[PDB]
């Protein structure tokens, strides 16, 4: 069986000789808790509801319905409304429902009770029950009636149900609606990189962990971690996302002052050779050495760690997210040229990076790195070994992006800033072992 | 104020269809002439003979009608476009045969509104470029060359034939009068000139603010080859090419992707969003069109706001055709389809008579436009009176009942008159919606019939869902549309809902219902279809006098 | 047991509506079994009933408590096809109106699938059950054979001017007058039949107005039937109120306003 | 608080004076188990996989890929394959994974471990892990290689991922894919009436229960059972689906020999009056009595029970499903005419029935009753008070339908006929209190 | 453009299940004669013309001249009984290397309609219109050709 040493975000050892199965999405209680948290937690924009009602801007995108303003001030009654929402959504007193006023009354964080998720088939009960509880709380507090309550309902729910989503509404999840899934098992893959950067509070080590965990939870739900593929995926999670054996942190540190994508390639090959993961296979007439992988899944995991460290070194030097697309491409292209072994995810990180480079530097779609996610058509193709690097690059950016975490995901930061699994994911994963 | 006259508005059309007829007669002589009575059916039969001979396979033949009878065992009667002198054969109002109706939908489908502020901020932040009236002017020239499908950066590009894409263009609009005045007027939608009544221009500029937008209209031929999902993508590609050239950017650098995301998503205002799997459709298709946006596309409100009924009934004409004839009758079904389900709402001045009667009743009982109480009691009074009067008209004029021969037509027209009266009177779309459902309930009990087998699914769900606030039930009427669950299937409702959504804002003397960007965009006279007078356009199409875009005569043979 | 009241209103039209609902409709004519079968067009007069599945007794049934306490109709027990009768009724004071044909079926007959439309009203049932239901309707005061008729297709006519002889327009002319009587010589889908089904004399215009369930200006004016209007209003109001909130307090929620009724 | 007496499918009392909350989807362990079972259980058509491979008919719909037949016989090796599937999907020995060979080898029932659902966001992990485990089991058993395994993979997964679903595949759930949801919270609403009839083994009382439970679970997930609406929904579930106070059973028994839709209307009004749910409000000049509801949610529940009993009496007499559409319409239209009170779901059962009648008797769409479900555009509009009647009508049909339970849902019968929650739902719900 | 429009406007629809429905539910006999009547009906109605109701308006036949329906079958005896104008002749078209026999063996003795709705319709609308348009006029044609109620279960 495989064991790993767990190290934290500062390069400090947490636990030695941990069974690889102990960090599995199917077994580690901290990971299971992370998934439950992202499913059941929603953010409420009370300030947005108040503006929509006062300005009759229901649905957003410059909509204005003249004469249909509703003059209510929920930000000034945030504590009363929060208490009513909690009473309406809680299943039993003392259950895990939480409703907290943030931003001096501008927002609520609503952790809907787990039981409402359990009683359903998907994850949407948090969104639906919060929107319903808010609508009722506003109707009661402001004595709304037959013909104005519908407008307030649209301030909360947006254009639902004319649209499948609460478009222009004021209830937010880090997940999207199920109908946006590209395929089977994609809901946990559909987390905007800008959101991931805010969950991590721009700590790039914690970013790698949060993003890698959720990506691999998705891969497991897709049915793509069965049999031999379970070890393949778990080693990638551990070495790329969980700083196993301190490889990501130490390779970044070693290359952080003068290193480049290429020096990280070199250190990764040297480590694989020194650790027995690869060996010289044959030598060509020129002297070029063809390598062989003695442990195929472990060679991939080393490439995954190298891809992450290269992102941290290159995007960290740029203090800019955009270089992540070329870093994933050239780390893997060049490590193949250096060894004659296939790179991370057997070309699928490189391929993802090719299209991601194109779609972050062209007219045709995409955007900056913060708009991508594991469900995006451009960036879905690797089983979890590309997006964590994207999220890390978004976190390292010092201000070069137009669609930035602060401009698209501000409420996510406030909602998860004091949530322990997001504040210290590596410590919580290790403590759950 | 308006005064309802002593002669019903529908009498002229009856007399023009039936010269010399005693309009009180409940009986008629049937001659059973069949199709030969009718010039259009005879023309169709001859066309079917040519089709069959040319392709070696039977097609249209009136004698294939079942029972050994051809169409026209009764008299086949033509249709007067309401408020127009034009009387046309019924087939001339089938969407397939009517290019005005086709082009109205193509003009909506090929339109996207795209903000410019985010793109300009991107150029400033990432490249340090200064955006000026001069740089914007260069961009507007670039985008009007590239948008129809022509090249600006690469060498050895092939291009669209400019004559095939002559309807494609881009204009900008803004609430900032200073910017609007600096750009060549050929590139600008002039809000002040178009919205010169009742201070509508100031209402629109206040709502839009000092923000800048592009109204993009991609080529008709493209949406005809493809779908409405092409529109925002096509727009974004050529916006991006134009920014590259006009700001000397690298032709493909990271900042270009921010422009792409802005133009495709963040600053893009679709006409309609996507639909769920059972009726899967791309964006910019009719099922995603909200009633507020439909009402805002129609422009009679900027021409004559002092007559709220006229604009209201032009919205009905716009919506009933699109939603019943093209959307429900084609996209969601097909065949012969649903022409007369919709013509009932825009021909023979019938809905006009019933609605002006109600307007007069409400003016006298409740007072000026938009001042009536916004409550269920008022909806009840107006709907009942308007519906009873209309039913009495159908009972007293046999050829009126024979025109709206299907109960579904009668139900939609009586309920539209009820709800439009309530909208104008109260200024409230949601109260008007209660009046709509009340009309149906009143109608059903009077005659012991309503519409077709499945007409009142939304009807019977209707009253209780007006004032629901539950997730998939509650919704203000302006934001409902053809995907509101109860509304997702049936003829005789969707275009009428758009009509009384317009009626409520006309009664309130607003400049728009739901989105001022939509309102300005569709006011532009450079569109092919004249959104300011819907029924006049339909008459041109029915008379073969409407020239649509998108034809391929430039690139096809002819010959004997 | 509970005594039904069926429907409000005090005019003779409301009385007629309660007759149709309660099934207390007078028999006015006789139609032979063979004539009716020929008109319906599903099998030759005298022929065995075709089957869509075996008789229940022969094939057995699942162990269902509902099947075991609900008696099948004769046609269901036999496995008959589900077939239909369909009628069109003139808005010029025909005795019947579509919804009230459907209520007559739903209240007074077992195992029936009625459907209401503006220009047609259908009853689907196991063939032999459908025949019995159609016989009851066609022999009764619910039918004038000039103002109503069997039309399984091509139904146009309910809303049209009557012909000069008082017959409702039928594009297929399945019926006509001979010697004062209405004769049907095609089946309900327009196929000629080898007999003349004599449906007897049309009702006089006066008799039709005495027997009709429709409100219109030349009979009982709908505007004057304030009890029916009150009923419609009460149902709409309470539906609106309870969709907002299903409780008595909703009946005076803001937005209701000064609702008022004529007779209550 | 409200209490109910619970009765079984044969009209016998199970438990008295049960708190209405104890039958809630959020609280009753049997309901929660039913939801878990439908989420995580899949049927495998091994005979279908074998036929697709031997006939190169991958993807169905008359497809044939000449030359690409793969000659494998999984029905003959079903026990070995089942054991391998179990080993590949089970998370821990002794967990709730089950794999059972059915039909002599033609089919498997696979109950994927609940932990795989818990670790994901939706319910699809059962379908995906089963499909993956099967593909691997076949590859191993039959020594498949690089270029033929892809074809066998399509025998299992259908045309996925060219399509979003496993179209033409051989892994079946009673649920559909999430992207087919019409809106938020609809996954448990998307259960075909033919499937529900097979879950119940054509026991119409048990069909009412299974369908009503799942419909209301969906309504709860939609956020439409919050506050006062929780009592509204729970009373409808109890009285229409759980035979509360034996009302559905007794009304059906009382009207089963000679009754009609109309006599059931009459008994429902009489019961509401005798039980104090409604009272005479005012009397019109003609003597017509306007009634008032003294308990609005209870009056709805009585109308829901009556709608169900009317379906049992009318479709039971016809022994035919099609009359359910007119039964739901005319029961509710006539009870309003009889009382001047609004009918079931305040018109939404009637309205659903209007469109359902149309779309089960016209050219335009729909079909026979068996093709409808709570997610169908035609039949979605009532919050759970229409579809259970549809499923009951489908169960009562003696052979009039072309698209029947036996022709569309045969494998569902075999998969669930030994599953206790589906064999005796009313007894299991009562025992869980 | 026309290549794509020819693909988008095409749907293939089996006839066996429809024929089984008529047999089971109505007790109708399906014969080469009833199929021939159906093929005439569907080629009148498919382009957008009326067969049941009175006072219907219709598409201009010249605007929909590309719309038609043919049947095809691996049953050579049925194919030979239907007027050739309505039938795709597999044996004439697939005369090389025994391709006709391979196609007929794969299709078997099943019957299919190749429906091609009007180009002008998919140009005004989208490819989603195709299977729906096809089904509406197939339905109207079965109603007429088999003397059904025009709207029964
Ligand atoms: C602006 C981009 C970035 C982007 O997102 N798309 C562009 C431009 C876009 C535009 C150019 C239209 C115009 O000239 O105004 C269009 C036609 C798409 C559109 N918007 O309609 C296009 N490219 Ni490009 N584009 C092409 C190509 C190419 C080749 C051209 C290389 C050369 O040596 O000429 C290179 C990529 C590469 O190096 O591999 C290329 C780049 C680029 N392509 C660079 C601009 C290059 C430049 O500055 O000259 N295209 C091709 O390689 C062939 C097909 C050709 C496409 C037109 C057609 O198929 O007819 C066109 C496809
Ligand atoms: C076969 C159906 C069942 C169904 O699913 N659709 C039908 C037929 C369908 C066909 C008829 C075309 C043809 O004649 O070949 C089309 C045009 C749809 C299509 N496939 O293109 C249609 N109905 Ni219909 N259908 C209509 C209507 C109606 C009215 C007609 C009643 C009368 O008194 O004439 C009744 C419903 C009712 O009673 O309320 C009706 C029924 C029916 N409708 C009955 C046939 C009735 C008959 O046997 O005559 N339609 C209308 O009420 C007006 C609009 C009219 C539609 C065409 C148009 O909008 O121009 C047409 C809409
Ligand atoms: C990526 C995605 O765009 P978004 O990132 O969603 O804007 C997608 N475009 C494309 O895939 C464009 C493909 C055609 C142009 C590039 C050809 S190489 C689309 O519009 O749905
Ligand atoms: C119900 C549904 O059909 P299906 O049951 O999915 O076949 C749907 N049709 C419709 O809603 C037809 C609407 C237009 C024809 C009837 C107008 S009253 C559709 O095709 O997606
Ligand atoms: O007769 S039906 O109401 O089903 C269809 C009318 S077009
Ligand atoms: Cl394996
Ligand atoms: Cl290995
Ligand atoms: Cl005559
Ligand atoms: Cl109450
Ligand atoms: Cl509440
Ligand atoms: K198109
Ligand atoms: Na030319």
Numbering used by the authors:
A (entry chain E), D (entry chain B): 2 to 434
B (entry chain A): 2 to 561
C (entry chain C): 2 to 265
E (entry chain D): 103 to 255
Sentences from the study reporting this entry:
Here, we obtained the true atomic resolution structure of their methane-capturing system (Methyl-Coenzyme M Reductase, MCR), circumventing the isolation barrier by exploiting microbial enrichments of freshwater nitrate-reducing ANME-2d grown in bioreactors, and marine ANME-2c in syntrophy with bacterial partners. Methane capture, the first reaction in AOM, has been proposed to be carried out by the Methyl-Coenzyme M Reductase (MCR). In the proposed mechanism, the heterodisulfide, made of Coenzyme M (HS-CoM) and Coenzyme B (CoB-SH), would react with methane to generate methyl-S-CoM and free CoB-SH through a radical mechanism catalysed by the Ni-containing tetrapyrrole cofactor F43019,20. Despite their physiological differences, these ANMEs have extremely conserved MCR structures, similar to homologs from methanogenic Methanosarcinales, rather than the phylogenetically distant MCR of ANME-1 isolated from Black Sea mats.
Here, the original sample used to initiate the enrichment was collected from the Amon Mud Volcano in the Mediterranean Sea at a depth of 1120 m and a temperature of 14 °C. The microbial enrichment, grown at 20 °C in batch serum bottles since 2003, mainly gathered ANME-2c (with a relative abundance of 32%) along with microbial partners based on 16S rRNA gene sequencing. The dataset obtained for the ANME-2c enrichment was also of sufficiently high quality to unequivocally determine the sequence from the electron density map at a resolution of 1.34 Å. The derived sequence perfectly matched the one of ANME-2c MCR from the metagenomic data. MCRs from ANME-2c and ANME-2dO contain reduced coenzymes trapped in the active site (i.e. CoM-SH and CoB-SH). ANME-2c MCR includes the conserved N1-methylhistidine and thioglycine, the common 5(S)-methylarginine, 2(S)-methylglutamine, and the rarer S-methylcysteine, didehydroaspartate, and 6-hydroxytryptophan. The dimeric interface is exclusively formed by the interaction of the α-subunits, mainly via the C-terminal extension. The dimeric state does not disturb the access to the active site. Due to the low quantities of MCR obtained at the end of the purification and the slow growth of the consortium, we were unable to test whether this dimeric arrangement reflects a crystallisation artefact or a stable entity in solution. Despite the different environmental niches, the marine ANME-2c and freshwater ANME-2d MCRs have high amino acid sequence identities of 63.6%, 61.5%, and 71.4% for α, β, and γ subunit, respectively.
